[PDB]
Amino acid sequence: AAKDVKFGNDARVKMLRGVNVLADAVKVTLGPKGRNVVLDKSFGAPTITKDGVSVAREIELEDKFENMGAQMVKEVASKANDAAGDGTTTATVLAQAIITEGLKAVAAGMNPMDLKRGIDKAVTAAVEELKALSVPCSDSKAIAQVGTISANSDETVGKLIAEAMDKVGKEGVITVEDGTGLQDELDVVEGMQFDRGYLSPYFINKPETGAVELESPFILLADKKISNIREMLPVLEAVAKAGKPLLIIAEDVEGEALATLVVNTMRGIVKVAAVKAPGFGDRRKAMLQDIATLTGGTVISEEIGMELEKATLEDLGQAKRVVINKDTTTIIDGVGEEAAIQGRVAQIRQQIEEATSDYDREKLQERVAKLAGGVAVIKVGAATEVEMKEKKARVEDALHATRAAVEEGVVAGGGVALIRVASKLADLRGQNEDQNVGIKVALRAMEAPLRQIVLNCGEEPSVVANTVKGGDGNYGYNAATEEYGNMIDMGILDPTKVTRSALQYAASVAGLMITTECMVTDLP
Amino acid sequence: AAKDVKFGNDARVKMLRGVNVLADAVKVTLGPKGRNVVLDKSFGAPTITKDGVSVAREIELEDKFENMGAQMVKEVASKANDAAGDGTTTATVLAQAIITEGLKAVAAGMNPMDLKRGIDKAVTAAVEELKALSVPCSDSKAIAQVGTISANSDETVGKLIAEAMDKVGKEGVITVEDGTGLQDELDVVEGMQFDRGYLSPYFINKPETGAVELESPFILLADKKISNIREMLPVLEAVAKAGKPLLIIAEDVEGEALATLVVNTMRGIVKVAAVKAPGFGDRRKAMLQDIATLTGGTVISEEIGMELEKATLEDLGQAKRVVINKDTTTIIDGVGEEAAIQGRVAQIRQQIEEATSDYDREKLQERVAKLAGGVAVIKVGAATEVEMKEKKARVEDALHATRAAVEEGVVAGGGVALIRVASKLADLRGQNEDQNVGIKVALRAMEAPLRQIVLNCGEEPSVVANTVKGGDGNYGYNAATEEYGNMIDMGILDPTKVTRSALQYAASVAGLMITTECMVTDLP
C-alpha cells in the first residue's frame, strides 16, 4: 500500500487541527451547564447526548493526518474511562490545553524532549500535591454522603452502598442486578471476581455498559490454550441442548476458536463468552481450581490426559449470573456445597503457615478474600417497572464514584482541585529554560477544566478563574446556582482517583504528541 | 466510517432548516380548513392524505444535518400519537414555534440552559392551568356527546360506546371488530389486556390500528427468556397442523428466537406474535398464571424443570382474537372453563382480605379488574360491506377520543385552550432575564396552533387571534363556519389529554434542540 509522509511543522498542524475537532466536540458537554451534542444514526432518529465518551467514540475525520491526531487523544478519553469511569471530558479538555500550548512552544523553537520532561515533572508533583488536598472517606457515614450526591440527592441509594460495604468490606466485591419486586434486597452469595477481561469486544450484549451479561451460564474450565475449535465442539454441542449460555475460562482462546465463537454468538447461535485465566503459571493452576470448586465444575488440562473431546457436563461449572468488564470478570452465586468451598478455603489456610516467604503470603490472602469473602447482590425495588430500571443505573453510577472515594478519596470539585494545585506549584522549576516553560504549560492547562465549565455557564471564564485563585482552600464556583462558596459544603466533589487519572493520561498523550516529528498514513 | 462535524451556530441553522421542512409539510393539514398533501409511491397512484402522521413519516431530507433536525421533531409527532392518537399535527406546529423563537434567542446571545428551564417551567404551569380549564366527563350522558361529535355527528356511534362503558366500566377494556350482519352487537367475553405491545414492528399486518390482529389464535405461556428457536420448533410446526396463528408471551423474546419468528410470519409460513409478560419478578409469575387459566393452557417455568420441547397443543391456551398495539395487547374469548376462571376469582378473593402489607391490596384489585372485570366486544353491522367497513372505522375514530375524555377530560377546541392559558400566565417569571424570555417563547408558541388553523381558513391569523384574546372563557373561532362563539356549545372540543401531550412533547424536544452545540453525522 502506497503511503503519504509528512514532516515536522507541516505534520504537527494536522494533529492540532485533528485534536481540536475532537476536543471542541467534547468540551461543550462539560459541567452541569453543559450543552447537548447530537449524533446521527443511519437507522431512524438521531441520538441526543451529553456523555463525553459517546461523543468521542463517534469522531473520525476525513483528512487521514487530522484523523490520526483526533484518534490519538480519543485513546486517552477511553482509557480514563477504563481507570475510573468518570472524568473523560475532563481528560480531553486537559489534553487539548497541554497540546495547544505545548505545540506553540515547539513552533517557537524549543526542545520537545525538554518540554515533555517539564510537563511530566509538573504532573508527578501535581499528583503528589493532589494526595495532600484529598479528604479521605473512612467511616461508613461519610461513605453514605458520596453515594447520595452522585445519585442526584437520593438517600435510598447511599444507604444501600453503605450496607453493602459493611458486609463484604472496602475491598469486597459488590454487584447490582434487576430487582424482584418492590423493596431493595441485599444478600451475600458465594462468588468471585478476578482481574481479566473479555477475549474480544464483540462478546458484548449490553447496549450501553460494554459488558457481557449471561443468565444461568455453564462454565468450562481449561488449563491449556485453545487454538482449533475442533476440541470445543462436543462440549459446545451439549450446551446448545438446554439453551443456556457458555463461559470459557482458559489460559487462552485465541486464533481460530475465538473467531468461530464470535461468528456464532453474533449470528445468534448460542450465547458464549471467552476469558483469559487470572494470573500466570503456578499461581494460575491454583486459582482456576479455586473457581472450579466454587463454581462446581472440573478443570481440564492436557497434563493428566483429560481432553475436551471427552468432556461431559459435570466438568462444566454452573453460576447464577456472570458479568464481564473490559478488564474484569465476575461471578454471582455458583453451585458448590458450603463445605466444598470452605474446605478449599482451609486448604489455603494451611498454606499460610507452611510456606515461609514475603510475596508468597500475599497471594494466598488475596485468594481467600475473593473466595470466602463473598459477593454482594443488591436487587433494586420500585412499583412500576420503568421506575426500577431507572433506579438501577442510578445506583451503578453512584457506586463507581464511591469505589474511587474509598481508594484515593475525594477532592474539591468544580475543577478547583487542579486550579488550587496550579497556584501551589508556581515555584516549580526544571533544569533548563525549555523545561521551565514545559511546567508552565502544564500549570496553565490545569486552569482549563474550570474555565470550560464557566464558559458553558455563560459567564466569562477569565473573571471567575481569577476570583477562585484569589481565595484559598476549597473555595470555588458553583455553575448550577451561579454562586461562590465552599465546594465540599455545597456537595460538589470529585473522587481524587478520577482527577488523578484525567490529568496523568492527558499528559501522557500530549507528551507523545509533542515529541512527534514524522507521520505515516495511507494515501487518499 | 468517516464523519462530518458541525459546531454552534453553523450546526443549529441546519436543524432549523430541517425542522422547517417537516413542520411546513405538516402544518398545512391542520384544522378542518386543512389542505391535502400528496405522497408519492413507486407502485402506481400517489396517496392524497390530510393525516399529519402519514405526512411526517415520509419526510427524510438529503442534507444529513437537515435530516437530523427533521427526524428529531418527527420522533415527537409519533410519540404524541403513542400517548393519545390525536394531536400529532398540533404537536408539530408547537414544536416549530418553540424552536424557531428559541433559536432566535440563542443567536441573540442568551443561555440555552436558562431558555430550556424557562420553557419547561412555563409548560409545567400550563399543564397545571389546563387541568383547571378542563370540563370532566363523568356521567354516561356526557360521554355519549363526545363519541357523537368525534364520529361526524353520528348518534349510533356514541350510543354504543356509552353502552360498552356501562358494562365493563370506565377502566374496562373495549374492543371493536367486524360485524356479522345488519345490527350492532355487544357481548362481554372472557378476556384480558396488559401493558405490553409487539416486541418488533415487523409483526404488523394491517397498519390501520397500527397493530397485530389474529383470528382464532393459539397462545403459549412461558416464564423464561427465549434464547434460541431450537426450542420453539416442536411447538411452532405443531400449530401448523390444523393451521392457525400463534401468540407468544414470554419473559422476553430475544436474539435468534426473535429474528427467525419475524422472518417466518413475514414470509407467511405460520403467523406468530411476540409480546412480553406484564409486570415483573414475583407478580410476573402471578399475572401470567391468570392468563393460563383464562386461556385454558399451561405455564412453562425456570424453577420447576419444564422445557419447550415437550409441550403439545393441549398445553396451549386459545382465543377468538388478539389485538396488539405498540404499548398494548388485548385478548378476546378464553376457552378456559367457566369454573376454573372463577376458581382464580376465589384465589385472589382470599388474597385481598388476607393481606398484611398495604400495597398488595392495590395491585391485586388491578388483577381481578383484568380477570373478572371483563372485555367488551362491539360488532358493527350494516347491509353493504362497504358501509360495514366505513361504520366500523367510525367507531374506533370515536373511541380513542372518548377514552381521553374520561381520563383527563375535554378542553375548549380550536386551539383556544392553549391561547387561553397564554393570557393567564403573562405574570409568570423565572430567575434571570434569560429564563424570562424562555417563558415568553413558550407562551407565544401556544398561539401558533390557532393561528395556523386560521391561516388555512384564508383569514388573517393576527386579526382572529387578537379577537379571541379580547373575549374571555370558551369563546373561540369556528373555522368551518367562519363564525365566532362558544366552542363547547358548537361541539368543537379537544380531549385535555391530547392537548397536554401535544404541548409537553413539543417542549421536550425543543428543549433538547435548543441546548444543541455539536452535531456528528456520516459523510456525504
Added chain:
Amino acid sequence: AAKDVKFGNDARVKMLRGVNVLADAVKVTLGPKGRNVVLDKSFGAPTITKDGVSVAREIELEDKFENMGAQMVKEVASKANDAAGDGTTTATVLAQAIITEGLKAVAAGMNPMDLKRGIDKAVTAAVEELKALSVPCSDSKAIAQVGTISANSDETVGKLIAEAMDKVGKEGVITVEDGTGLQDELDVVEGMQFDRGYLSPYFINKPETGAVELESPFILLADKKISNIREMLPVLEAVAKAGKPLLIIAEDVEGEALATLVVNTMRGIVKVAAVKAPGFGDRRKAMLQDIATLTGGTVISEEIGMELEKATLEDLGQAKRVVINKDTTTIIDGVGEEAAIQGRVAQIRQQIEEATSDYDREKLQERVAKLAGGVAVIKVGAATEVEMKEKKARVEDALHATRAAVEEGVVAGGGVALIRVASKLADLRGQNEDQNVGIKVALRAMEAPLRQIVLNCGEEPSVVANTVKGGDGNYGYNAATEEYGNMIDMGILDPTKVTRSALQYAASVAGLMITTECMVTDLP
C-alpha cells in the same frame, strides 16, 4: 446611472461588515499601549502612525454597500475631531459597540425606532451624569496642571498657557506661531477671531492640522456674493506685485469664482483662501467694517455704488498671519491703527449705551469682545528647527486640551468616566421592553473604550473592567504602568468635553444606522 438596491437584514449586514473594518483598523490604536497602523502611499515610503484620524481617513472599501457603512461612522470620527480635536478613536470604538449590539437586537426582532429612543435617552442621561462627575478647572494653578500632563510632563508648556490665559482671559483668543530665537515670547497684539470655515477644503496648505495658513496676507472685504472673475481680475492682478497671499471675505463665493480660486491655487499661481462673511443681514455689514478697521483696508458693496472693478491695493486689508480650520477663521496681528481701533471701540461701546433690546445688546457685547479682546500669541523657543517643531506640536494639542478643560472640565481618564456612568444608570428604564434593551445596549457600549485599552495592554479586558466596577469613584486602571489607583492623582485625565462629544456623536450615527432599512448605491 444604474443602481443597486438592498433591503432589510441583507442591507444591514453589509453596513456592520463595513463599519467593522473601519473600527478594527482604528480601535487597535487606542490608549498608550496602542499599536501602529501602516498606511501605504504611492510615492516612496509608507506612513507609520497611531493617529486614529489619519487611519480613519484612509479607509474606503471595495463593496459599495460595505463602503457606505464604513464611510458613515467615518463621518463621526471626523466630527468628533471638529468638536474637540481629541477622542476620535474613543468615538469610533463606542459607535461600533452601539451598532454591533444594536443590530443584534434588530435581528432578534425588536423595533429600531424604540431602540434609537432608548439609546438617546440613555445618552442624554449620561451627559447629565458626566457633568456631575466633572472636576472643573477654575484657577490658573489647576489650569497649569492640565497643560503639563498633556505635553508629556513638560512644565515649560503649562507655564506659557497659564500666562497667556492670564492676559486675554478664559474666553480670549490664543495662537501659537514659530519662535524668533532661544526664549519663549508672549505679546498681546491687536487681532480678532470669528466663527466661519473655509469655502474649499483644497485651500488647506498644512494638512497635518487640516488648516489654511498665509504669512503677511492681503484681505478683500465685500458684502456681495462673488460669481464672476470679471469683477475679480484687477484685484488679483495686483496681488503678484508685492508677492504675498490673499484672503477673500465676501458674502459668499460661488460656482465660478470658487472653482477659479480653488484650482488656481493648486498651480501655485497666487496662494489664496475664501471664507464666508461672519453673521447675517444687518449685523453682517458692521462686522465686516470691524475687520476692515482691524486690518486697515476698506469694504466694497453694490449698495453704496462701489464696484469690484476699481478695487486697489489700499482697499485691501493686511494682517501678519491668517489661519482657517474646517469651521474657524482667525486673523492675527492685523496692521490697523492705534487711533482707528480705539476709535471704533469707543464707538461700539456707545451703541450699547443706546441699546434698545435685550438681544441687540448681547451681539454688540460679543462684537467688542472680539475686536478689543485682541489675540494672544506664543512664540515657542528651543535649540534648532527640530525641537522647535516638536515643542510647537505638543503645545497646539495641549492648548486644545486646556481649552476643553476650561469650558466643561476634566473627568477621570482611562475610559473609567464612562464605565462609572454605566453603573450609575443601571436603574434607567424606557417605556416598553424594546426601549429598555436600547438603554442596556448603550450602557454596555460605555464599557468598550476601557476594555479596548486593556486589550492593547495584553491583559484580559473582562478581568480589569470587573475590578474597576467593584471599586468606586476615580479608581481605574493605568495601562502604561499596569497599576491600579486614583486616575486624577496619576495624571490620567480626559477633558469632559471630549468624552461628551465622543459619546454623543457615536450614538447619533448608530441611531441613524439602526433605523436603516434600505440602501441605494451605484452598480459595480
